[PDB]
Design a protein around this ligand. Structure first.
Ligand SMILES: *[C@@H]1O[C@H](CO[C@@H]2O[C@@H](C)[C@@H](O)[C@@H](O)[C@@H]2O)[C@@H](O[C@@H]2O[C@H](CO)[C@@H](O[C@H]3O[C@H](CO[C@H]4O[C@H](CO)[C@@H](O)[C@H](O)[C@@H]4O[C@@H]4O[C@H](CO)[C@@H](O[C@@H]5O[C@H](CO)[C@H](O)[C@H](O)[C@H]5O)[C@H](O)[C@H]4NC(C)=O)[C@@H](O)[C@H](O[C@H]4O[C@H](CO)[C@@H](O)[C@H](O)[C@@H]4O)[C@@H]3O)[C@H](O)[C@H]2NC(C)=O)[C@H](O)[C@H]1NC(C)=O
Ligand SMILES: *[C@@H]1O[C@H](CO[C@@H]2O[C@@H](C)[C@@H](O)[C@@H](O)[C@@H]2O)[C@@H](O[C@@H]2O[C@H](CO)[C@@H](O[C@H]3O[C@H](CO[C@H]4O[C@H](CO)[C@@H](O)[C@H](O)[C@@H]4O[C@@H]4O[C@H](CO)[C@@H](O)[C@H](O)[C@H]4NC(C)=O)[C@@H](O)[C@H](O[C@H]4O[C@H](CO)[C@@H](O)[C@H](O)[C@@H]4O)[C@@H]3O)[C@H](O)[C@H]2NC(C)=O)[C@H](O)[C@H]1NC(C)=O
Lengths: 55, 212, 207, 53
């Protein structure tokens, strides 16, 4: 569907990051929608935040 | 006569799964009479009212009735995480306002297996042949299936509804019809499947004339 | 008050002479107050009298359900005759009428193709045997599986799906142990439809 | 199911020159006695051919 694989992937993984809260997750996803070119950065950013907030 | 009726429809499975798409919940009011036609909608997400809904201009029907539709844009993650969406329909002349609530089917997600099957040898005598995509073992039944070839969508396909299997999971078949010649010439065809239990909500299988 | 629902016979019953097709008229929301229900059956407008009404049965509600069954001739259903149920009962201003018949339109012969498991499915313990049935009209159809004269019952069949050309298609999926498939057992997909010779055909599938 | 019976039923159903009453009667006999399929089909075929223009 011509669709952006990198964007779609970043969206999927961010959706499943277990240690983000709703507000954090929603914010990353919004940024993804608004600027597809920032997907790599947003996914890396979300990964670290998720790891930082691990038990 | 008996008041209007309200029907609430979920977003297309694909729209909730692909971030590049915009999922909608659709509230449809039927049996609106010509004499009351000023319908008001109130939308709620898990009980909390939201205000971004847009309403379509009333449309006249077959049976001298009116039909009016309200559309609420939703967040992919909200639908997938099981949030409830309520449409509330009101009139100065409804005895009570009507409420409808929907949400994604509950239950442990199950990853589909996608298999492509070539035409039967018997079918190779026809001018058109059937390419088959079997998708089994998925839950919930919300799913989208597409075909494409050389980067571009094929659209002469039909997909059976999801069918409940023995083990409580669902399966379906999608049938793509192509000219036999296109098949004989080695054109590659792809069955794309979108479902929440898949990585990236997306997988794809290809199919072409090849060594048995 | 009460409602009435009229159901056609099973596609197989109208097609196989060994079987007895029925049209079934079902009345629901039947009052406890006035529970004496009267049926009138009509075949192409002419009243018939061979219908058998079941003794009214209590429901989930504090309500009764009552059913009358009209035995029909195979040839009559297939030749497009209309069957009307007329229900009379005091909790209705006028008596209710329902009419059904076989779908109109040129009958089309179903093409039946069997497809073996996908190569990739052979890594699983169970595999899928597929029967594609396309190009049939009307949608009324029956599909079964068997092996060595005996019925295979671990199968599921999709509903009929309207195709581009106005005809219908479906798939039937038989699930077997991979080992059974590996050993060269022959499996058969049986299809019953009015546009088939003898209302019956059968396609075989083996490794 | 009985193949000869089913086959006889099918053909009689499609014989173009029988009238409704004749067709219904052959079919009834088929239902009542499956063993008579061969003769009933032969009988119906000839009647159909006899009533050809
Ligand atoms: C008081 O309680 C009553 C009890 O019913 C109960 O109700 C529900 C709420 C729940 O509690 C259940 O546990 C229970 O069933 C209740 O009665 C019901 O009332 C509603 C009406 O509001 C009926 O609704 C729909 O009816 C049609 C569907 O019924 C078929 O399918 C059901 C499931 O698929 C099944 O349960 C039914 O029994 C019926 O099944 C058909 O049965 C026929 C008849 O026997 C079969 O055909 C025969 O079968 C023989 C073998 O047995 C043989 O093969 C023979 O040759 C053959 O002729 C057939 O196999 C089978 N078919 C199917 C598909 O199952 C439905 O079609 C209808 O919708 C149609 O019409 C609408 C217009 O009115 C359209 O809008 C719609 O699109 C569609 O076209 C109804 O929506 C319900 O069926 C009733 N219950 C029963 C058992 O009939 C009652 O309403 C309650 N009181 C009040 C006031 O509400
Ligand atoms: C007067 O006429 C109106 C005009 O509508 C009619 O359109 C078609 C259907 C045809 O009949 C024409 O001749 C008419 O002009 C009548 O309006 C209908 O009213 C019905 C109830 O009385 C109502 O019934 C079912 O509605 C649900 C499905 O609606 C879907 O699907 C149908 C076909 O499958 C489409 O026609 C609809 O447009 C609608 O499409 C969906 O639209 C969504 C929003 O745009 C979209 O997101 C979806 O992708 C899209 N889906 C599909 C598949 O296209 C159906 O699910 C309900 O099932 C219930 O069944 C029982 C009993 O109700 C209940 O217990 C269950 O729990 C289910 O909820 C309904 O049965 C129908 O939708 C109305 N049509 C429309 C277009 O809205 C009106 O009834 C007439 N009145 C009178 C007095 O005669």
């Amino acid at each position: 569907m011509k669709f952006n694989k990198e964007q779609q992937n970043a969206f999927y993984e961010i959706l499943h990051l277990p240690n983000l809260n709703e507000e954090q997750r929603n914010a990353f996803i919004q940024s993804l929608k608004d600027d597809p070119s920032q997907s790599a950065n947003l996914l890396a950013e979300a990964k670290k935040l998720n790891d930082a907030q691990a038990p | 006569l008996g008041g209007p009726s309200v029907f609430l429809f979920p977003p297309k499975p694909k729209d909730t799964l692909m971030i590049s798409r915009t999922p909608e919940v659709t509230c449809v009011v039927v049996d609106v009479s010509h004499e009351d036609p000023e319908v008001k909608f109130n939308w709620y997400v898990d009980g909390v009212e939201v205000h971004n809904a847009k309403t379509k201009p009333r449309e006249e029907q077959y049976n001298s009735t009116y039909r009016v539709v309200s559309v609420l844009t939703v967040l992919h993650q909200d639908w997938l995480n099981g949030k409830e969406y309520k449409c509330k329909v009101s009139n100065k002349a409804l005895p009570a306002p009507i409420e409808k609530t929907i949400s994604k089917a509950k239950g442990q997600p199950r990853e589909p297996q996608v298999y492509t099957l070539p035409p039967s040898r018997e079918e190779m005598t026809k001018n058109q042949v059937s390419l088959t995509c079997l998708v089994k073992g998925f839950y919930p039944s919300d799913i989208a299936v597409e075909w494409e070839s050389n980067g571009q969508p094929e659209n002469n396909y039909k997909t059976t509804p999801p069918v409940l299997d023995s083990d409580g999971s669902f399966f379906l078949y999608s049938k793509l019809t192509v000219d036999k010649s296109r098949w004989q010439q080695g054109n590659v065809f792809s069955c794309s499947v979108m479902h929440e239990a898949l990585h990236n909500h997306y997988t794809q299988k290809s199919l072409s004339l090849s060594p048995g």
